Amino acid sequence: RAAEDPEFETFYTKNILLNEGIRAWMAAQDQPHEKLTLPEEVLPRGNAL
Amino acid sequence: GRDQETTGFAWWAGNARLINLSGKLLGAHVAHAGLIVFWAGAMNLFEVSHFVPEKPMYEQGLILLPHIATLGYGVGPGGEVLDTFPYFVSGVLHLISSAVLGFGGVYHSLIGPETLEESYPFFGYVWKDKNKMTNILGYHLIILGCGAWLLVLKALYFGGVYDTWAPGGGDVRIISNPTTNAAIIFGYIVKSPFGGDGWIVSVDNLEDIIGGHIWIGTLCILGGIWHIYTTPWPWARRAFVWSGEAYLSYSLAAVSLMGFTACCFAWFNNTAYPSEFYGPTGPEASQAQAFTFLVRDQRLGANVASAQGPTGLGKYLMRSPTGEIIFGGETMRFWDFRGPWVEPLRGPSGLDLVKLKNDIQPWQERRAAEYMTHAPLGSLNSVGGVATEINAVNFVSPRSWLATSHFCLGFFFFVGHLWHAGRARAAAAGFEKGIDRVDEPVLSMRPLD
Amino acid sequence: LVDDRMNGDGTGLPFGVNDGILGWVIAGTLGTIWAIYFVSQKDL
Amino acid sequence: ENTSLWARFCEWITSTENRLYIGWFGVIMIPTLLTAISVYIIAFIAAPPVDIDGIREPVSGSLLYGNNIITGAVVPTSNAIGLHFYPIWEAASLDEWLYNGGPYQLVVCHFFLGVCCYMGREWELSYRLGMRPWIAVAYSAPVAAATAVFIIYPIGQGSFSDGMPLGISGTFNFMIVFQAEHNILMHPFHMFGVAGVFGGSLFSAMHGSLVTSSLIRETTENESANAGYKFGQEEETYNIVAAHGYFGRLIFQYASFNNSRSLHFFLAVWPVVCIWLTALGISTMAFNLNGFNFNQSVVDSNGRVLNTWADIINRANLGMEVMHERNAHNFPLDLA
Amino acid sequence: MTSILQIALLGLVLVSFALVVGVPVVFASPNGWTENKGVVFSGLSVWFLLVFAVGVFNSFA
Amino acid sequence: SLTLILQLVALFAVVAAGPLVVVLLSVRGGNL
Amino acid sequence: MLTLKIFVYTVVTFFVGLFIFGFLSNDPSRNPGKG
Amino acid sequence: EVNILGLTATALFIIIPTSFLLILYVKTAASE
Amino acid sequence: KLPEAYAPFSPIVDVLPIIPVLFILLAFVWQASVSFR
Amino acid sequence: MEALVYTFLLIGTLGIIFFSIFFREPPRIA
Amino acid sequence: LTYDELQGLTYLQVKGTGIANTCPVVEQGTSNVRELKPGDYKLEKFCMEPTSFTVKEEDAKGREEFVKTKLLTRLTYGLDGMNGSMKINNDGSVEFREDEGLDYAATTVKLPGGEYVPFLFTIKEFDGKGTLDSFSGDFLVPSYRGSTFLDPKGRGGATGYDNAIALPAKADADEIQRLNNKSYTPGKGSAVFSVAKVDTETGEIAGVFESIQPSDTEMGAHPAKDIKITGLWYGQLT
Amino acid sequence: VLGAALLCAIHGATVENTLFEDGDGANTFRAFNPTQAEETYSMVTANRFW
Ligand code: CLA
Ligand code: CLA
Ligand code: CLA
Ligand code: CLA
Ligand SMILES: CCCCCCCCCCCCCCCCCC(=O)OC[C@H](CO)OC(=O)CCCCCCCCCCCCCCCCC
Ligand SMILES: CC1=C(/C=C/C(C)=C/C=C/C(C)=C/C=C/C=C(C)/C=C/C=C(C)/C=C/C2=C(C)CCCC2(C)C)C(C)(C)CCC1
Ligand SMILES: CC1=C(/C=C/C(C)=C/C=C/C(C)=C/C=C/C=C(C)/C=C/C=C(C)/C=C/C2=C(C)CCCC2(C)C)C(C)(C)CCC1
Ligand SMILES: CC1=C(/C=C/C(C)=C\C=CC(/C)=C/C=C/C=C(C)/C=C/C=C(C)/C=C/C2=C(C)CCCC2(C)C)C(C)(C)CCC1
Ligand code: OEX
Ligand SMILES: [Cl-]
Ligand SMILES: [Cl-]
Ligand SMILES: [Fe+2]
Ligand code: NA
């Protein structure tokens, strides 16, 4: 529904977006075996923060 | 003292053992008052000894030196400290008075008269004597009215109290013509507690502050005389429980309401709590972020009135729910913030675009220490701003400290009011210890189904 | 404006009233309850 | 007392013969909570999308607008409103009131009044039954927590949009954002609350085990062992003498809980005081007192940052921080 | 004049320390307050004298 | 530092003052 | 919409008046205990 | 449209245990 | 800072806030000494 | 249907708790 | 209220009353309109507030009708603080040209049936040609959202995902309208103005307007409707 | 877990608020006797209250 609708948002979609940021910004310093040297621009950001 | 086998109270309820002991109760009170004045003097001397003069009086974790500084004792025009001798004098006077009070409390607790009625009928009191309790309440009401009139005298004749709303960024301003309008004062007390008004946290000027203090002092003195020369009416007798525990619960509820109310003053008020002494409030530094970024991005060259954000509402300026022009960021919740560095920039309709473009003042620009750090974030073990900040700056806002602590103690005192009100009602009814087990009320009632 | 609004949010209205009818119905309801209680107090 | 209107009303209100006790606290509990129940149910079923963040980006939260029970939620009030008391009569239309988040304010205000009067009604029934009155004092802890998450935290942050959404996924959203911005896990009051619920479950299991185990035979492998005697005798079953011996032999037989009253007082006081502590931790983090901040506390002799579990928590927190309100921020430092 | 103030304040500190240690001890002693009345009164008198002395010496130092 | 030494000695003097009163009342009679 | 405010104000004033005058109407005497 | 698998699963998970419990309650209340 | 005539007494001042915390603990010492009767 | 099943389950739970409150078995032995 | 008594009110008196969203009026002026002195003018404080918000939806049977709607956003729809030029000639020809100000307002309105219609009420970059009785022209309409706006799934334009992140097996030639395009191309709208109640002593004109402009296309997913905005405008000539 | 903590708090408060008299002192904790064969709290009163 949210893929075919740019208007449909729920708190569950907000939680999914938060989980994506947790994974992306936590993996590099969380799993040193993975050697995730991800640059800052491919990491997801909101606006201004 | 006494043991549990005679009083019926255990050690963790030992202060109940002196409920009916007037002299020991008075000694506990006087010793506790000595404790309060001792904390005042000791913490004042600690804050004076730990005072760096070049820094403002909020990066140092000082909470009560701002309380003296609000009265105008040793405060320069812009907000500088000038001298710390009034603070030192206040601390030393509190320490000596606490020594006297502690001696009196220790004396009355240890070797004072055990019970006051047999030798001192003026001070003796039973908890069921409504006339005597109203006499004591009247004495304390007259004392509190004199205390409020003391602040009135300091504001009116002794050249004190610091005004943030004075032009240029505040000044210690002697207050002339306080607003003693009953309509204004009681419209303050009966209005809504929400964001549009604020019930008691709405005083934007020392004139209304001192008019309300005149009203509260006169009313307290008159009510004290009234309680001295009256006895509670039969409706009050039928409504209230007349015991020492019930009176404590009434005081606990009132003082918990006062604690929550003072927490709200601390978080929102910037008139009785100047920003130069207490740091920014919640709404400011957030309004200051939008204001400073607006003036910076128009100093670069980009216009701020026709600039829209990612959502199309305005990166710098937008409209409030009412048609006032407000700051366009996420600080649209704080559009009711009134500050000394905002009002000359603010007009009848909105934020006065022409004033933002041309009539900005250099002192309002320099008031970016409001925004920079010092937004009332700060974490429990100090460190900087938001919870994800690193160990760079040692700061937590004094407004945050004495709002958080005061809400905690206000809620605890509401809980204590509940406890003491319930136990006082059970004591007056007769079942504070439990159920009589041979005639319980439940067996005399019809079953529910 | 495109619609009619109460426009009473804010402005420090006493007890939230913006018309005299609200204060009058508050006073009338409180007075009615007080009158019933007064003529019907003390159980009997 | 019998031929008077306010009399008959008073001894009907204070009557203990009602199926549910009303009382003078109930005359305020019942209408506010019924209003909150009605508005919450109607909003959860058919609430139109509401712009929570004040950025003209509504979220649905209601079943008829395409979500389930887990992800459906009565969404908080608009950020544009703030804590400015927006009821129906302050709106020009019901559609506008619904678009701005008025149902949340209505339900939260009525729920706060209703739980306060529920506590008062608990006291009132304890008073009218000849009981002791501190069940309301025990109930004051969930009321404090609900007030902290629905009223006090929006007061501290300046907007009812900061209130906990009336739902499940909204509750998780409130949790994650609160973590990102206050570091609740590293807050000692929250540690006390977590220890309180864990110890409450522990002590509930221990008390249930000790009272369910310490029995003499009165119920056989059938429904009941009434062959000794049927219903209608005061010869009591149970035990607390061998149960205390078992609990003592369990560890070292000196932590004496032989007093049943002291044991039940401990069972009452531990989760209550811990939930008091965690509710006040939420209330302190409302004014941004926040949790422990040990980011880059460990440095070596040359001053290089040695990583830390607290630093990993910081990375997760800032990853949460950059996701929250992707479109609601225009300025770098998050203060409002 | 500052040295006189410092000596007076140190004397006041020691007198207050002696008073804090002894006043509860004298009060709660069995049959001790009516026999230590003179020494307790003298201690309180010197305490008040030292307080007033530091107060009047503050204006000169 | 000498400042820290005087802070410690003042701290020990004020911390030990209370228990000194209690033990003095315990060994010099009673009424506590 | 003003009449909705009038109706709600009347309802709230009614219930608050019932609360206050009911607690005024001899509440400490509504006990089974002797006292 | 219509998730008929979810509908059948939910309807069966409601009907079968509720009917089982209701039958047990009816046969228990019939013979005291 | 404290005035110049009171600067040596600032280390004594630095300990004075904790005395009220010491007072309730003194009460607990007295209860222990009376054996919590 | 999607929302109809959720509404039916919620009102069924509410009806169950209503029956448990009001049409319960009367309590016996204490 | 005219501009004279709006400046005579404090901020606290106007606050919370809805007065700040109302454009000033002219009470001492004349309705002759043509009496206005010709020349080159630089008007400031150009006010523009609406009185109705009607949306054009096309039925699937072939006729044109507008419908009245219900506003969801509160009093944020006025335009205030704009300025520009008016080259008025002796015959009456004008050269109205707005330059800068609060020349936009994000407005969300509700159609009958419960469909949300967001739009950006703009008059920015508008030129005016015609007489004093009626002059019209065209103005620039921005998208509604910037290219840094992220959808509920994090996809966007300048920044975003541009891919269905929820499921790794759906990016084919059916989500192109939702993922690949992400258009922010500005539209244009047409507004017609009219000058009434001219003032001679201080050059204060306050007429009416009727504006036609496209609605929001969200992110380019669906075509925009047409919004008709009618109301009053106000200006001071110097 | 939340229901277990709720049950612990409610059970403790209910037992402590239905404790019967069992004595004359103001401290109910010493009113308890493990030797007696009677229940220390009123289950009937607790059931009617809840
Ligand atoms: C604000 C704190 C405070 C205060 C002012 C008091 C005051 C009092 N309590 Mg109490 N108490 C407290 C806290 C407090 N308590 C706490 C927290 C507990 C729980 C542990 C108790 C438990 C308790 C019990 C069980 C009893 C009291 C009793 C008493 C009364 C008489 C004590 C007595 O006769 O024995 C004498 C005590 C002493 C000799 C030791 C105290 C030493 C002195 C007084 C203080 C320390 C020295 C001090 C610095 C001197 C100042 C010097 C001066 C020159 C400035 C007294 C009025 C008794 C009572 O109720 O009366 C019937 C009683 O039995 N209390
Ligand atoms: C007319 C008799 C009288 C007076 C004047 C007082 C006065 C006072 N009592 Mg007291 N009391 C009385 C009778 C009286 N009481 C009786 C009969 C009892 C029963 C035994 C008590 C029991 C009692 C207790 C238990 C306590 C007090 C306390 C206090 C003080 C509280 C004020 C405070 O500390 O805050 C601050 C003070 C102010 C804000 C006032 C500012 C100073 C002003 C300018 C001075 C007022 C002068 C004024 C003209 C004189 C008043 C006229 C008088 C006739 C009322 C205060 C000085 C408390 C205490 O111990 O405090 C140390 C306390 O705990 N009283
Ligand atoms: C209204 C109460 C209040 C408030 C708002 C403040 C605020 C402040 N104080 Mg202060 N203080 C207070 C009371 C208060 N204090 C009291 C009563 C004392 C006497 C002991 C002191 C003594 C004191 C000193 C010596 C110093 C401060 C300092 C400070 C500043 C920094 C505080 C800090 O470092 O972290 C705050 C510390 C904490 C948050 C510790 C938390 C303690 C909690 C409440 C324990 C309770 C948790 C839980 C319930 C435990 C249960 C166990 C229990 C059953 C025993 C700050 C502005 C420092 C300063 O900057 O100097 C100017 C400083 O050095 N204070
Ligand atoms: C000025 C307010 C006030 C006053 C005068 C009293 C007075 C009294 N209370 Mg009471 N109480 C209050 C507030 C007050 N209370 C509050 C706010 C609460 C809620 C927390 C309670 C809860 C309470 C209970 C449960 C009981 C009393 C009891 C009593 C009586 C005996 C007290 C005693 O000797 O215990 C001894 C004192 C102690 C053992 C010290 C207490 C240690 C506390 C619990 C730890 C916290 C202290 C720590 C330094 C602070 C940390 C920070 C904080 C913000 C958490 C006595 C007449 C008893 C009673 O009912 O007798 C009739 C009793 O059972 N009170
Ligand atoms: C808009 C401004 C907002 C701010 C103004 C707010 C004003 C609030 C004033 C309330 C003060 C009343 C205190 C009584 C407390 C209970 C006394 C009681 O238990 O009372 C019981 C007691 C028992 O004997 O009796 C008695 O002592 C009788 C004494 C009670 C006095 C009765 C009040 C006057 C009655 C007027 C009737 C109103 C009639 C209806 C008006 C209709 C208008 C159209
Ligand atoms: C009864 C009782 C109690 C209580 C007690 C108390 C409360 C006490 C107190 C007391 C007090 C309340 C005290 C106080 C004090 C004070 C003092 C003693 C002082 C002083 C002085 C000095 C000496 C100073 C000096 C200085 C100066 C002047 C300045 C500079 C610095 C210095 C510091 C040097 C208890 C709980 C135990 C238990 C029960 C019984
Ligand atoms: C100073 C100041 C001011 C002023 C203030 C004021 C003026 C206040 C007040 C106030 C008031 C004027 C108050 C009053 C009150 C009262 C109360 C608070 C009460 C009560 C009570 C109760 C709660 C009751 C209960 C009950 C009932 C209900 C019935 C039966 C009986 C009983 C008891 C149960 C101002 C702000 C201006 C400025 C600043 C400062
Ligand atoms: C101003 C000043 C002063 C004053 C002072 C005072 C005001 C006093 C005091 C004092 C005090 C106030 C002291 C104290 C101390 C205390 C302590 C040291 C404590 C303790 C406790 C504990 C350690 C506990 C233990 C325990 C128990 C027994 C119970 C249970 C278990 C436990 C383990 C917890 C002087 C004269 C020096 C001079 C200089 C300055
Ligand atoms: O809205 Mn919910 O939340 Ca208290 O932070 Mn700033 O703003 Mn928003 O951000 Mn993170
Ligand atoms: Cl922002
Ligand atoms: Cl979010
Ligand atoms: Fe049990
Ligand atoms: Na963002």
Per the structure block, which two tokens stand in for D86? 């927006």
Contact K86, D107 (CB under 8 A): no
CA distance B112 to D98: 67
- Tokens 């060259």 locate to B301
> Among B11, B419, B425, B433, which is best to mutate for testing ligand 4, by the most ligand atoms less than 8 A from CB?
B419
Contact E12, E54 (CB under 8 A): yes
CA distance D90 to C3: 13
Contact D158, D144 (CB under 8 A): no
CA distance B421 to chain J (A): 30
Which listed ligand is nearest to A12 at the C-alpha?
11
Contact present, K and G (at least 3 Cβ pairs less than 8 Å): no
- Taking Cα atoms as reference points, which of B144, B138, B36, B159 lies closest to residue B97? B36
CA distance K202 to B245: 74
Asked whether residue B32 is marked as a ligand-binding residue, the answer is no
B448 chain-J contacts, CB cut-off 8 A:
26
CB of D79 within 6 A of ligand 9: the answer is yes
CA distance B410 to B403: 10
Question: Three-state DSSP class for B395?
Answer: coil
Q: What is the CA radius of gyration of chain E?
A: 14
Q: What is the largest CA-CA distance in chain F?
A: 43
**Cα atoms found within 13 Å of the Cα of residue D181, Cβ hemisphere only:** 27
> Among B190, B200, B238, B265, which is best to mutate for testing ligand 7, by the most ligand atoms less than 8 A from CB?
B200
CA distance B126 to B29: 17
DSSP-assigned letters across all residues of K11-77: HHHHTTTTGGGSPPB-SS-BS--TTSPPEEE--EEEEEEEEEEEEE---TTS---EEE-EE-S-S--
* Phi and psi torsions of D102, nearest 5°: -60, -35
Sequence-separated (6 or more) residues with CB below 8 Å from residue D109:
none
Contact D129, D119 (CB under 8 A): no
On whether any CB of chain D is under 8 Å from the CB of C11, the answer is no
Q: What is the CA radius of gyration of chain F?
A: 14
Q: Which residues approach ligand 8 with their CB closer than 6 A?
A: E 13, 16-17, 20; F 14-15, 17-19; I 12, 16, 19, 22-23, 25-26, 28-29, 32
CA distance B395 to F19: 37
Q: Which domain holds residue E3?
A: 1-61
Contact K216, K119 (CB under 8 A): yes
Q: Compute the distance from residue D178 Cα to the ligand 12 centre, in Å.
A: 38
* Phi and psi torsions of B306, nearest 5°: -105, 20
Angle between helix D23-46 and helix G2-24 axes, rounded to 10 deg: 150
Per the structure block, which two tokens stand in for D46? 């058919």
Contact L8, D267 (CB under 8 A): yes
CA distance L25 to B385: 54
Sequence-separated (6 or more) residues with CB below 8 Å from residue I18:
F14
Query: What's the domain count of chain E?
Result: 1
DSSP-assigned letters across all residues of B31-77: HHHHHHHHHHHHHHHHHHHT--SSS-TTTT--SSHHHHHHTTTT--S
The experimental method is cryo-EM
CA distance B240 to B248: 12
CA distance D216 to chain A (A): 52
Interface test with C, best of B181, B184, B191 (most C CBs within 10 A): B191
Contact E59, E6 (CB under 8 A): no
On whether any CB of chain D is under 8 Å from the CB of A9, the answer is yes
CA distance D171 to D169: 5
DSSP-assigned letters across all residues of chain C: --S-----SSTT-GGG--SHHHHHHHHHHHHHHHHHHHHT-S--
* Phi and psi torsions of D53, nearest 5°: -95, 5
Option in D6, D84, D85 nearest C40 (CB):
D6
CA distance G18 to chain B (A): 15
Enclosing H/E stretch for K109: strand K106-110
Q: Which residue of A has its CA nearest to D48?
A: A8
Flag if L43 and J27 touch (Cβ within 8 Å). Answer: no
- Tokens 């019967």 locate to L20
CA distances from B196 to C6, K30, K112 (A): 14, 40, 32
Contact B21, B126 (CB under 8 A): no
Contact B169, B79 (CB under 8 A): yes
Which residues lie near ion ligand 11 (Cβ < 5 Å)?
A: A 14; D 324
Sequence-separated (6 or more) residues with CB below 8 Å from residue B189:
B199, B200
CA distance E28 to B106: 10
What pairing do the DSSP bridges indicate for beta strands K39-41 and K135-141?
unpaired
Contact B161, B154 (CB under 8 A): yes
- Taking Cα atoms as reference points, which of B173, B207, B194, B197 lies closest to residue B338? B197
CA distance K43 to K238: 6
K9 burial level (CB within 10 Å; 0-12, 13-18, 19+): middle
CA distance C10 to B338: 14
Option in E16, E23, E44 nearest B106 (CB):
E23
Enclosing H/E stretch for B330: none
CA distance K132 to B35: 81
Would you give the DSSP letter of residue K198? B
Per the structure block, which two tokens stand in for K23? 């454009």
Q: Which residue of B has its CA nearest to D294?
A: B391
Can you give chain L as a three-state secondary structure string? CHHHHHHHHHHHHHHHHCCCCCCCCCCCHHHCCCCCCCCCCCHHHHHHHC
Please name the amino acid found at residue D116. Answer: C
Resolution in Å, one decimal place: 2.8
- Taking Cα atoms as reference points, which of K28, K43, K115 lies closest to residue K81? K43
Sequence-separated (6 or more) residues with CB below 8 Å from residue K32:
K198
Would you give the DSSP letter of residue K125? T
What pairing do the DSSP bridges indicate for beta strands K127-130 and K187-194?
unpaired
- Taking Cα atoms as reference points, which of D79, C3, A11 lies closest to residue K110? C3
Enclosing H/E stretch for K182: none
CA distance D283 to D147: 9
Can you give chain D as a three-state secondary structure string? CCCCHHHHHHHHHCCCCCCCCCHHHHHHHHHHHHHHHHHHHHHHHHCCCECCCCCCCCECCCHHHCCCCCCCEECCCCCCCCCCCCCHHHCCCHHHHHHHCHHHHHHHHHHHHHHHHHHHHHHHHHHHCCCCCCHHHHHHHHHHHHHHHHHHHHHHHCCHHHCCCEECHHHHHHHHHHHHHHCHHHCHHHHHHHHHHHHHHHHHHHHHHHHHHCCCCCCCCCCCCCCCCCCCCCCCCCCCHHHHHHHHHHCCCCCCCCCHHHHHHHHHHHHHHHHHHHHHHHHHHHCCCCCCCCCCCCECCCCCECCCHHHHHHHHHHHHHHHCCCCCCCCCCCCC
DSSP-assigned letters across all residues of J1-30: --HHHHHHHHHHHHHHHHHHHHSPPPP---
Sequence-separated (6 or more) residues with CB below 8 Å from residue D36:
D106, D107, D110, D111, D114
- Taking Cα atoms as reference points, which of D161, D144, D96, D86 lies closest to residue D277? D144
E30 chain-F contacts, CB cut-off 8 A:
29-31
Which listed ligand is nearest to A15 at the C-alpha?
11
CA distance L9 to chain D (A): 4
CA distance L5 to B9: 30
- Taking Cα atoms as reference points, which of K232, F5, D311, D82 lies closest to residue B387? D311
